[PDB]
CSV table of C-alpha atoms and ligand atoms in Angstrom, one decimal:
chain,number,residue,atom,x,y,z
A,9,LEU,CA,0.0,0.0,0.0
A,10,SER,CA,1.5,3.3,-1.2
A,11,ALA,CA,1.9,6.4,1.0
A,12,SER,CA,-0.6,8.2,-1.2
A,13,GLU,CA,-3.1,5.4,-0.8
A,14,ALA,CA,-2.5,5.2,2.9
A,15,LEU,CA,-3.0,9.0,3.2
A,16,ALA,CA,-6.2,8.7,1.1
A,17,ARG,CA,-7.7,5.8,3.0
A,18,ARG,CA,-6.7,6.9,6.5
A,19,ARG,CA,-9.8,8.3,8.4
A,20,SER,CA,-10.9,8.9,11.9
A,21,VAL,CA,-12.6,5.5,12.6
A,22,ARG,CA,-15.3,5.6,15.2
A,23,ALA,CA,-16.4,2.0,15.3
A,24,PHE,CA,-14.0,-0.9,15.9
A,25,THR,CA,-14.5,-4.6,15.9
A,26,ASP,CA,-13.2,-6.7,18.7
A,27,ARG,CA,-10.7,-8.3,16.5
A,28,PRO,CA,-7.6,-8.4,18.5
A,29,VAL,CA,-4.6,-6.3,17.7
A,30,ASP,CA,-1.2,-8.1,17.3
A,31,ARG,CA,1.0,-6.6,19.9
A,32,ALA,CA,4.0,-7.7,17.8
A,33,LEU,CA,2.6,-5.8,14.9
A,34,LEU,CA,2.1,-2.6,16.9
A,35,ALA,CA,5.6,-2.9,18.2
A,36,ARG,CA,7.0,-3.2,14.7
A,37,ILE,CA,4.8,-0.2,13.7
A,38,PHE,CA,6.3,1.9,16.5
A,39,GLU,CA,9.7,0.9,15.4
A,40,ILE,CA,9.2,2.5,12.0
A,41,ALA,CA,7.2,5.5,13.3
A,42,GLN,CA,10.3,6.5,15.3
A,43,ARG,CA,11.8,7.4,11.9
A,44,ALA,CA,9.6,10.5,12.0
A,45,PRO,CA,11.7,13.7,12.0
A,46,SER,CA,11.9,16.2,14.9
A,47,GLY,CA,13.5,19.5,15.5
A,48,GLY,CA,17.1,18.8,16.6
A,49,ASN,CA,16.1,15.1,16.6
A,50,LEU,CA,14.7,15.6,20.1
A,51,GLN,CA,12.1,12.9,19.4
A,52,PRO,CA,10.0,14.4,22.1
A,53,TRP,CA,7.0,12.1,21.8
A,54,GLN,CA,6.3,9.5,24.6
A,55,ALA,CA,3.5,7.0,24.5
A,56,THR,CA,1.7,4.8,27.0
A,57,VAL,CA,-0.2,2.0,25.2
A,58,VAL,CA,-3.0,0.4,27.2
A,59,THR,CA,-5.4,-2.5,26.7
A,60,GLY,CA,-7.5,-4.9,28.7
A,61,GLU,CA,-8.0,-4.3,32.4
A,62,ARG,CA,-5.7,-1.2,32.5
A,63,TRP,CA,-7.6,0.3,29.6
A,64,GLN,CA,-10.8,-0.4,31.4
A,65,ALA,CA,-9.4,1.3,34.5
A,66,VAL,CA,-8.7,4.6,32.6
A,67,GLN,CA,-12.2,4.5,31.3
A,68,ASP,CA,-13.7,4.2,34.8
A,69,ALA,CA,-11.5,6.9,36.3
A,70,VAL,CA,-12.6,9.3,33.6
A,71,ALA,CA,-16.2,8.0,33.9
A,72,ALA,CA,-16.0,9.1,37.5
A,73,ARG,CA,-14.9,12.5,36.3
A,74,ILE,CA,-17.7,12.7,33.7
A,75,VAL,CA,-20.6,12.2,36.2
A,76,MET,CA,-19.1,15.1,38.2
A,77,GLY,CA,-20.5,17.4,35.6
A,78,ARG,CA,-18.5,20.6,34.9
A,79,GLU,CA,-16.5,20.2,38.1
A,80,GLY,CA,-14.9,16.9,36.8
A,81,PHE,CA,-13.2,18.7,33.9
A,82,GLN,CA,-9.4,18.9,34.0
A,83,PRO,CA,-8.2,20.6,30.9
A,84,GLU,CA,-4.5,19.9,30.1
A,85,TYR,CA,-4.6,23.0,27.8
A,86,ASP,CA,-7.1,24.8,25.5
A,87,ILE,CA,-8.3,22.3,22.9
A,88,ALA,CA,-10.3,24.8,20.9
A,89,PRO,CA,-8.4,28.1,20.5
A,90,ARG,CA,-9.8,30.9,22.6
A,91,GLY,CA,-10.9,33.3,19.9
A,92,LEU,CA,-11.8,30.7,17.4
A,93,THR,CA,-13.7,32.7,14.7
A,94,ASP,CA,-16.7,31.3,13.0
A,95,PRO,CA,-15.0,31.0,9.5
A,96,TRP,CA,-12.6,28.5,11.1
A,97,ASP,CA,-15.4,26.7,13.0
A,98,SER,CA,-17.5,26.2,9.8
A,99,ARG,CA,-14.8,23.6,9.0
A,100,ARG,CA,-15.7,21.6,12.2
A,101,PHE,CA,-19.4,22.2,11.6
A,102,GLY,CA,-19.0,20.9,8.0
A,103,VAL,CA,-17.6,17.6,9.3
A,104,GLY,CA,-19.7,17.8,12.5
A,105,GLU,CA,-23.1,17.4,10.7
A,106,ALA,CA,-21.9,14.8,8.2
A,107,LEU,CA,-20.7,12.6,11.1
A,108,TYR,CA,-24.3,12.8,12.4
A,109,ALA,CA,-26.0,13.4,9.0
A,119,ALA,CA,-29.8,15.5,23.9
A,120,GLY,CA,-28.4,12.7,21.7
A,121,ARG,CA,-25.0,14.4,21.7
A,122,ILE,CA,-24.2,13.3,25.3
A,123,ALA,CA,-24.6,9.7,24.2
A,124,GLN,CA,-22.2,9.7,21.3
A,125,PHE,CA,-19.6,11.8,23.1
A,126,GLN,CA,-19.5,9.3,26.0
A,127,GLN,CA,-18.6,6.7,23.3
A,128,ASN,CA,-15.4,8.8,22.9
A,129,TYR,CA,-14.4,7.9,26.4
A,130,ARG,CA,-14.7,4.3,25.5
A,131,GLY,CA,-12.5,4.8,22.5
A,132,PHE,CA,-15.4,4.0,20.2
A,133,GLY,CA,-14.9,0.3,21.2
A,134,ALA,CA,-11.2,0.1,20.3
A,135,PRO,CA,-9.4,-2.7,22.1
A,136,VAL,CA,-6.2,-0.6,22.4
A,137,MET,CA,-5.7,3.0,23.4
A,138,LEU,CA,-2.5,4.9,22.9
A,139,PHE,CA,-1.8,7.9,25.1
A,140,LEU,CA,0.6,10.4,23.6
A,141,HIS,CA,2.4,12.7,26.0
A,142,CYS,CA,5.6,14.6,26.7
A,143,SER,CA,7.5,16.6,29.3
A,144,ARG,CA,5.9,19.9,30.3
A,145,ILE,CA,9.2,21.6,29.2
A,146,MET,CA,8.4,21.0,25.5
A,147,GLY,CA,7.2,23.9,23.4
A,148,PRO,CA,4.9,24.4,20.4
A,149,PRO,CA,7.5,23.2,17.8
A,150,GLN,CA,7.9,20.0,19.9
A,151,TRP,CA,4.1,19.6,19.8
A,152,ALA,CA,4.5,19.8,16.1
A,153,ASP,CA,7.1,17.0,16.3
A,154,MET,CA,4.5,14.9,18.2
A,155,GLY,CA,2.1,15.5,15.3
A,156,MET,CA,4.7,14.2,12.8
A,157,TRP,CA,5.1,11.0,14.9
A,158,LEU,CA,1.4,10.6,15.4
A,159,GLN,CA,0.5,10.9,11.7
A,160,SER,CA,3.4,8.5,11.0
A,161,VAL,CA,1.7,6.0,13.3
A,162,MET,CA,-1.8,6.6,11.8
A,163,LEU,CA,-0.5,5.9,8.3
A,164,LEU,CA,1.4,2.8,9.3
A,165,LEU,CA,-1.8,1.4,10.9
A,166,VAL,CA,-3.8,1.7,7.7
A,167,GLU,CA,-1.0,0.1,5.7
A,168,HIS,CA,-0.9,-2.8,8.1
A,169,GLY,CA,-4.7,-3.4,8.0
A,170,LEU,CA,-5.5,-1.5,11.2
A,171,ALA,CA,-7.4,1.6,12.0
A,172,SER,CA,-7.3,4.5,14.4
A,173,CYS,CA,-9.0,7.6,15.9
A,174,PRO,CA,-7.0,10.5,17.3
A,175,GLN,CA,-8.8,11.8,20.4
A,176,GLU,CA,-8.0,15.1,22.1
A,177,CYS,CA,-11.2,14.6,24.2
A,178,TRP,CA,-9.0,12.7,26.7
A,179,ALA,CA,-7.2,16.0,27.5
A,180,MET,CA,-10.4,17.2,29.0
A,181,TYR,CA,-9.4,14.9,31.9
A,182,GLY,CA,-5.6,14.9,31.6
A,183,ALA,CA,-4.8,14.8,35.3
A,184,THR,CA,-7.1,11.9,35.9
A,185,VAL,CA,-5.7,10.0,32.9
A,186,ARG,CA,-2.1,10.8,34.0
A,187,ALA,CA,-2.8,9.7,37.6
A,188,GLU,CA,-4.4,6.4,36.4
A,189,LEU,CA,-1.5,5.9,34.0
A,190,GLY,CA,1.0,6.5,36.8
A,191,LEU,CA,2.6,9.4,34.9
A,192,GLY,CA,4.1,12.3,36.9
A,193,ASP,CA,2.9,15.9,36.9
A,194,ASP,CA,6.1,16.6,34.9
A,195,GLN,CA,4.3,15.1,31.9
A,196,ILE,CA,1.5,16.7,29.9
A,197,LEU,CA,-1.1,14.6,27.9
A,198,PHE,CA,-1.6,15.7,24.3
A,199,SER,CA,-4.0,13.2,22.9
A,200,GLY,CA,-5.3,9.7,22.9
A,201,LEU,CA,-5.3,7.5,19.8
A,202,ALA,CA,-7.9,4.7,19.7
A,203,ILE,CA,-6.4,1.7,17.9
A,204,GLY,CA,-8.1,-1.4,16.5
A,205,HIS,CA,-9.7,-3.1,13.5
A,206,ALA,CA,-12.3,-0.9,11.9
A,207,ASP,CA,-15.9,-2.2,11.7
A,208,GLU,CA,-15.9,-1.7,7.9
A,209,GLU,CA,-19.6,-2.1,7.5
A,210,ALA,CA,-20.5,0.5,10.1
A,211,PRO,CA,-22.1,3.7,8.6
A,212,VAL,CA,-20.1,6.1,10.8
A,213,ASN,CA,-16.9,4.7,9.1
A,214,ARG,CA,-18.0,5.1,5.5
A,215,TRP,CA,-19.1,8.7,4.9
A,216,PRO,CA,-16.7,10.9,2.8
A,217,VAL,CA,-14.8,13.4,4.9
A,218,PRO,CA,-14.4,17.1,3.6
A,219,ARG,CA,-11.3,19.2,3.2
A,220,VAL,CA,-10.9,22.7,2.0
A,221,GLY,CA,-9.5,23.6,-1.4
A,222,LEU,CA,-5.8,24.4,-2.0
A,223,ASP,CA,-6.8,28.0,-2.8
A,224,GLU,CA,-7.3,28.4,0.9
A,225,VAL,CA,-4.1,26.7,1.8
A,226,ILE,CA,-1.2,27.3,-0.6
A,227,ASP,CA,0.3,30.6,-1.9
A,228,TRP,CA,2.8,30.3,-4.8
A,229,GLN,CA,5.5,32.9,-5.4
A,230,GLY,CA,8.3,33.3,-8.0
A,231,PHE,CA,7.0,30.5,-10.3
B,9,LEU,CA,6.6,2.9,-2.8
B,10,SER,CA,4.9,1.8,0.5
B,11,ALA,CA,4.3,4.1,3.5
B,12,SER,CA,6.8,2.0,5.5
B,13,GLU,CA,9.4,2.6,2.8
B,14,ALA,CA,8.6,6.2,2.6
B,15,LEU,CA,9.1,6.6,6.4
B,16,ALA,CA,12.3,4.7,6.2
B,17,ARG,CA,13.8,6.6,3.2
B,18,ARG,CA,12.8,10.1,4.3
B,19,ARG,CA,15.7,12.0,5.7
B,20,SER,CA,16.5,15.6,6.3
B,21,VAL,CA,18.5,16.3,3.1
B,22,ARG,CA,21.1,19.0,3.2
B,23,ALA,CA,22.5,18.8,-0.3
B,24,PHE,CA,20.3,19.3,-3.4
B,25,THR,CA,21.0,19.2,-7.1
B,26,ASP,CA,19.6,22.2,-9.0
B,27,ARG,CA,17.1,20.2,-10.9
B,28,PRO,CA,13.9,22.2,-10.9
B,29,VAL,CA,10.8,21.0,-9.0
B,30,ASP,CA,7.7,20.5,-11.2
B,31,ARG,CA,5.0,23.0,-9.9
B,32,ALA,CA,2.4,20.5,-11.1
B,33,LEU,CA,3.8,17.7,-9.1
B,34,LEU,CA,4.0,19.9,-6.0
B,35,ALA,CA,0.4,20.9,-6.5
B,36,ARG,CA,-0.5,17.2,-6.7
B,37,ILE,CA,1.4,16.5,-3.5
B,38,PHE,CA,-0.5,19.2,-1.6
B,39,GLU,CA,-4.1,18.0,-2.5
B,40,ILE,CA,-3.2,14.6,-1.0
B,41,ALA,CA,-1.4,16.0,2.0
B,42,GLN,CA,-4.6,18.0,2.8
B,43,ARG,CA,-6.1,14.6,3.8
B,44,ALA,CA,-4.1,14.9,7.0
B,45,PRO,CA,-6.3,14.9,10.0
B,46,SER,CA,-6.6,17.8,12.4
B,47,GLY,CA,-8.5,18.6,15.6
B,48,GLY,CA,-12.1,19.5,14.7
B,49,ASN,CA,-11.0,19.2,11.0
B,50,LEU,CA,-9.7,22.8,11.5
B,51,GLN,CA,-6.9,22.2,9.0
B,52,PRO,CA,-4.9,25.1,10.6
B,53,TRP,CA,-1.9,24.8,8.3
B,54,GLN,CA,-1.1,27.6,5.7
B,55,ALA,CA,1.9,27.6,3.4
B,56,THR,CA,3.7,30.1,1.2
B,57,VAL,CA,5.8,28.3,-1.4
B,58,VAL,CA,8.5,30.3,-3.0
B,59,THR,CA,11.0,29.8,-5.8
B,60,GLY,CA,13.3,31.7,-8.2
B,61,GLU,CA,13.6,35.5,-7.6
B,62,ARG,CA,11.2,35.6,-4.6
B,63,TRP,CA,13.1,32.8,-2.9
B,64,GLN,CA,16.2,34.9,-3.6
B,65,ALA,CA,14.7,38.0,-2.0
B,66,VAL,CA,13.9,36.0,1.2
B,67,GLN,CA,17.5,34.8,1.3
B,68,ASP,CA,18.9,38.3,0.9
B,69,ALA,CA,16.7,39.9,3.6
B,70,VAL,CA,17.6,37.2,6.1
B,71,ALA,CA,21.3,37.5,5.2
B,72,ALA,CA,21.1,41.2,6.0
B,73,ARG,CA,19.8,40.3,9.5
B,74,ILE,CA,22.4,37.6,9.8
B,75,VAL,CA,25.4,39.9,9.5
B,76,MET,CA,23.9,41.9,12.3
B,77,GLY,CA,25.0,39.1,14.6
B,78,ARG,CA,22.8,38.2,17.5
B,79,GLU,CA,21.4,41.7,17.6
B,80,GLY,CA,19.6,40.8,14.3
B,81,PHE,CA,17.7,37.8,15.7
B,82,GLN,CA,13.9,38.0,15.5
B,83,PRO,CA,12.7,34.8,17.2
B,84,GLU,CA,9.1,33.9,16.4
B,85,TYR,CA,9.1,31.6,19.5
B,86,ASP,CA,11.4,29.3,21.5
B,87,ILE,CA,12.8,26.8,19.0
B,88,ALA,CA,14.6,24.7,21.5
B,89,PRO,CA,13.0,24.6,25.0
B,90,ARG,CA,14.8,26.9,27.3
B,91,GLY,CA,16.6,24.8,29.9
B,92,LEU,CA,16.5,21.7,27.8
B,93,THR,CA,17.8,18.7,29.8
B,94,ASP,CA,18.9,15.2,29.1
B,95,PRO,CA,17.9,12.7,27.6
B,96,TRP,CA,16.8,15.3,25.0
B,97,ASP,CA,19.8,17.5,25.0
B,98,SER,CA,22.2,14.7,24.2
B,99,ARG,CA,20.0,13.6,21.2
B,100,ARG,CA,20.5,16.8,19.2
B,101,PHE,CA,24.3,17.0,19.6
B,102,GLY,CA,24.6,13.3,18.7
B,103,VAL,CA,22.9,13.9,15.4
B,104,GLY,CA,25.0,17.0,15.4
B,105,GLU,CA,28.1,14.7,15.5
B,106,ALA,CA,27.1,12.6,12.5
B,107,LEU,CA,26.1,15.5,10.4
B,108,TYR,CA,29.4,17.2,10.6
B,109,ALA,CA,31.5,14.1,10.8
B,110,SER,CA,30.4,13.5,7.2
B,111,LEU,CA,31.9,16.8,6.0
B,118,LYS,CA,34.5,26.4,15.2
B,119,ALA,CA,34.8,28.2,11.9
B,120,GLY,CA,33.9,25.6,9.3
B,121,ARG,CA,31.3,24.3,11.7
B,122,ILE,CA,29.7,27.8,11.6
B,123,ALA,CA,30.1,28.0,7.8
B,124,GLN,CA,28.2,24.8,7.2
B,125,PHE,CA,25.3,25.9,9.5
B,126,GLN,CA,24.8,29.2,7.5
B,127,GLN,CA,23.9,27.0,4.5
B,128,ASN,CA,20.6,26.6,6.2
B,129,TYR,CA,19.7,30.1,5.1
B,130,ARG,CA,20.2,29.0,1.4
B,131,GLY,CA,17.9,26.0,2.0
B,132,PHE,CA,21.0,23.9,1.4
B,133,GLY,CA,20.7,24.8,-2.2
B,134,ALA,CA,17.1,23.6,-2.7
B,135,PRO,CA,15.3,25.4,-5.6
B,136,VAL,CA,12.0,25.6,-3.7
B,137,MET,CA,11.2,26.7,-0.1
B,138,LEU,CA,7.9,26.2,1.7
B,139,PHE,CA,7.1,28.4,4.7
B,140,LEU,CA,4.5,26.8,6.9
B,141,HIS,CA,2.6,29.3,9.0
B,142,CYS,CA,-0.8,29.7,10.8
B,143,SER,CA,-2.9,32.3,12.6
B,144,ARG,CA,-1.6,33.4,16.0
B,145,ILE,CA,-4.9,32.2,17.6
B,146,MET,CA,-3.7,28.7,17.1
B,147,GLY,CA,-2.6,26.7,20.1
B,148,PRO,CA,-0.2,23.8,20.8
B,149,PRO,CA,-2.7,21.2,19.6
B,150,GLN,CA,-3.1,23.1,16.4
B,151,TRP,CA,0.7,23.1,16.1
B,152,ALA,CA,0.6,19.3,16.3
B,153,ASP,CA,-2.0,19.4,13.4
B,154,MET,CA,0.6,21.3,11.4
B,155,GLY,CA,3.2,18.5,12.1
B,156,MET,CA,0.7,16.0,10.9
B,157,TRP,CA,0.4,17.9,7.6
B,158,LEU,CA,4.1,18.6,7.3
B,159,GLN,CA,5.0,14.9,7.7
B,160,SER,CA,2.4,14.1,5.1
B,161,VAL,CA,4.1,16.4,2.7
B,162,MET,CA,7.6,15.1,3.4
B,163,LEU,CA,6.5,11.5,2.9
B,164,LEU,CA,4.7,12.3,-0.4
B,165,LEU,CA,7.9,14.0,-1.7
B,166,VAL,CA,10.0,10.9,-1.0
B,167,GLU,CA,7.4,8.8,-2.7
B,168,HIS,CA,7.6,10.9,-5.8
B,169,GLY,CA,11.4,11.0,-5.9
B,170,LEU,CA,11.8,14.5,-4.2
B,171,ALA,CA,13.5,15.3,-1.0
B,172,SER,CA,13.2,17.9,1.8
B,173,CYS,CA,14.7,19.4,4.9
B,174,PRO,CA,12.3,20.8,7.5
B,175,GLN,CA,13.9,24.0,8.9
B,176,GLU,CA,13.1,25.9,12.1
B,177,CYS,CA,16.1,28.1,11.5
B,178,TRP,CA,13.8,30.6,9.6
B,179,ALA,CA,11.8,31.2,12.7
B,180,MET,CA,14.9,33.0,14.0
B,181,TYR,CA,14.0,35.8,11.7
B,182,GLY,CA,10.3,35.4,11.5
B,183,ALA,CA,9.4,39.1,11.1
B,184,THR,CA,11.7,39.5,8.2
B,185,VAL,CA,10.5,36.4,6.5
B,186,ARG,CA,6.9,37.4,7.0
B,187,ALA,CA,7.7,40.8,5.6
B,188,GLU,CA,9.3,39.5,2.5
B,189,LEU,CA,6.5,37.1,1.9
B,190,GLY,CA,4.0,39.9,2.6
B,191,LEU,CA,2.3,38.1,5.5
B,192,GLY,CA,0.6,40.0,8.3
B,193,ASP,CA,1.5,40.0,12.0
B,194,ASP,CA,-1.7,38.0,12.6
B,195,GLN,CA,0.4,35.1,11.2
B,196,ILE,CA,3.2,33.3,13.0
B,197,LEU,CA,5.9,31.4,11.1
B,198,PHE,CA,6.5,27.9,12.3
B,199,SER,CA,9.0,26.4,10.0
B,200,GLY,CA,10.5,26.3,6.5
B,201,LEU,CA,10.7,23.2,4.4
B,202,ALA,CA,13.5,23.2,1.8
B,203,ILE,CA,12.4,21.2,-1.2
B,204,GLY,CA,14.2,19.6,-4.1
B,205,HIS,CA,16.0,16.7,-5.7
B,206,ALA,CA,18.5,15.0,-3.4
B,207,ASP,CA,22.3,14.9,-4.3
B,208,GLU,CA,22.4,11.2,-3.7
B,209,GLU,CA,26.2,11.1,-3.5
B,210,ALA,CA,26.6,13.8,-0.9
B,211,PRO,CA,28.3,12.7,2.3
B,212,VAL,CA,25.9,14.9,4.2
B,213,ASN,CA,23.1,12.8,2.9
B,214,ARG,CA,24.3,9.2,3.5
B,215,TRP,CA,25.2,8.8,7.1
B,216,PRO,CA,22.8,6.7,9.2
B,217,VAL,CA,20.6,8.8,11.3
B,218,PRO,CA,20.2,7.6,14.9
B,219,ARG,CA,16.9,7.2,16.9
B,220,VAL,CA,16.4,6.1,20.5
B,221,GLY,CA,15.1,2.6,21.1
B,222,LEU,CA,11.4,2.0,21.8
B,223,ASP,CA,12.5,1.4,25.4
B,224,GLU,CA,12.6,5.2,25.9
B,225,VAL,CA,9.4,5.8,24.0
B,226,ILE,CA,6.7,3.3,24.6
B,227,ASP,CA,5.1,2.0,27.9
B,228,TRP,CA,2.8,-1.0,27.6
B,229,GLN,CA,0.0,-1.7,30.1
B,230,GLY,CA,-2.5,-4.5,30.4
B,231,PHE,CA,-1.0,-6.7,27.7
C,1,FMN,C1,-5.2,15.9,17.4
C,1,FMN,C2,-6.5,15.4,17.0
C,1,FMN,C3,-7.4,15.1,18.0
C,1,FMN,C4,-8.7,14.6,17.7
C,1,FMN,N1,-9.6,14.4,18.7
C,1,FMN,C5,-10.8,13.8,18.3
C,1,FMN,C6,-11.8,13.5,19.3
C,1,FMN,O1,-11.6,13.7,20.5
C,1,FMN,N2,-13.0,13.0,18.9
C,1,FMN,C7,-13.3,12.7,17.6
C,1,FMN,O2,-14.3,12.3,17.3
C,1,FMN,N3,-12.3,13.0,16.6
C,1,FMN,C8,-11.1,13.6,17.0
C,1,FMN,N4,-10.2,13.8,16.0
C,1,FMN,C9,-10.6,13.5,14.6
C,1,FMN,C10,-10.9,14.8,13.8
C,1,FMN,O3,-12.2,15.2,14.0
C,1,FMN,C11,-10.8,14.4,12.3
C,1,FMN,O4,-9.4,14.1,12.0
C,1,FMN,C12,-11.2,15.5,11.3
C,1,FMN,O5,-12.6,15.6,11.5
C,1,FMN,C13,-11.0,14.9,9.9
C,1,FMN,O6,-11.6,13.7,9.7
C,1,FMN,P1,-10.8,12.4,9.2
C,1,FMN,O7,-9.6,12.2,10.1
C,1,FMN,O8,-11.8,11.2,9.3
C,1,FMN,O9,-10.3,12.5,7.8
C,1,FMN,C14,-9.0,14.3,16.3
C,1,FMN,C15,-8.0,14.6,15.3
C,1,FMN,C16,-6.8,15.1,15.7
C,1,FMN,C17,-5.8,15.4,14.6
C,2,FMN,C1,10.2,21.1,12.9
C,2,FMN,C2,11.6,20.8,12.4
C,2,FMN,C3,12.6,21.8,12.2
C,2,FMN,C4,13.8,21.4,11.7
C,2,FMN,N1,14.7,22.4,11.5
C,2,FMN,C5,16.0,22.1,11.0
C,2,FMN,C6,16.9,23.1,10.8
C,2,FMN,O1,16.6,24.3,10.9
C,2,FMN,N2,18.2,22.8,10.3
C,2,FMN,C7,18.5,21.5,10.1
C,2,FMN,O2,19.6,21.2,9.7
C,2,FMN,N3,17.6,20.5,10.4
C,2,FMN,C8,16.4,20.8,10.8
C,2,FMN,N4,15.4,19.8,11.1
C,2,FMN,C9,15.9,18.4,10.8
C,2,FMN,C10,16.2,17.6,12.1
C,2,FMN,O3,17.5,17.9,12.5
C,2,FMN,C11,16.1,16.1,11.7
C,2,FMN,O4,14.8,15.8,11.5
C,2,FMN,C12,16.7,15.1,12.8
C,2,FMN,O5,18.1,15.3,13.1
C,2,FMN,C13,16.4,13.7,12.3
C,2,FMN,O6,17.2,13.6,11.1
C,2,FMN,P1,16.4,13.0,9.9
C,2,FMN,O7,15.1,13.8,9.7
C,2,FMN,O8,17.2,13.1,8.6
C,2,FMN,O9,16.0,11.5,10.1
C,2,FMN,C14,14.2,20.1,11.5
C,2,FMN,C15,13.2,19.1,11.8
C,2,FMN,C16,11.9,19.5,12.2
C,2,FMN,C17,10.9,18.4,12.5
């Protein structure tokens, strides 16, 4: 499977089968993903991969947070930018309706069970790391996501876990020197599920690339 | 070429031939790279791709700052974390070893080549709105790595370059970008000189032991 095809076929999967994931395969995938670049070769990404009973523990700890209402929230940072304008948000609303086309509470709690993935990756780093190092983490993460598709697996990046970073970090036994960026649900896609088959929009290049001197 | 092979063969190339880059191919690489994910599908990345005379103007303007010594610096942000400790600090000097081994004064001289994109014919400047936060910066990395892998797949090479953020204001000026924008990084783009010493040394990575923790398996 070519990089183009991997890129094309990678999507945020929100329904996984219970087909087990080969730990050997994941390990091999992480080996190659480490070839992602990073400023100064800092390789600042760190990951705690959980499954089974531990993975169920994280779910329950956060579940406890969730019933606490707005008091249970423990933001690691600002997920949505303060000062998001509505022309930016129309992008999320464009994908937001299509995902669906109150009830919302129900689907969003599925986030916190990783949409049924058997494995959950938690991507974190030292609190000393700055914005370019977070960009390095993105490079690694997208490397992982593409390798998963190539290898017959699927994934869903989830920043929703950062709503409860401290709880997650505590449950993972990570120090308060670490900060949680995102979760990544991992597993085999339910490839007959509707939520996994709608076409996902992107803006046109006219909104992205400016050419000069050509 | 498979995604695994792309990941494996992608390196930070610091010696390019002067074979031009096909504008058409670059355009085709960017529509596919746009399939990168992003929080909320915000797609926060923006890029200004320069070549020829424009790419020469950016070079000259930054060179003017460069001779100003350290009084000329215009950092967009903190490139290296201030107070960077081990294990991390040993990692950059170690790759620093291998990069120069395959080549004070001369050391300095080579580093300044950064500001000519190591001779690359094309330079992409990746930027975004200043409203964007750290998670949006990770979104940009996701996009950038998509581009770098697609290049490799199509026989092109690149060098991501944060060195340009040392003179962000000047670069933004020469590109005509507003101060609502912040420059993250450059990406030098071109055809790799596949006999260059600088391009053939094996690039180290830490073992998974330092990266991955497994729980419940
Ligand atoms: C850093 C990051 C965090 C994300 N967090 C979530 C999340 O918490 N819940 C969710 O449903 N999707 C999440 N996503 C998926 C995005 O909504 C998705 O990538 C975007 O809508 C584009 O859709 P696609 O990836 O299927 O192509 C996240 C994506 C990224 C890159
Ligand atoms: C965001 C970013 C900025 C970078 N900036 C520079 C740079 O300014 N100069 C340079 O020589 N290399 C730069 N690099 C390349 C890294 O040094 C390189 O990725 C690392 O040593 C690993 O080497 P490799 O990518 O060839 O495997 C940058 C990489 C990243 C991700």
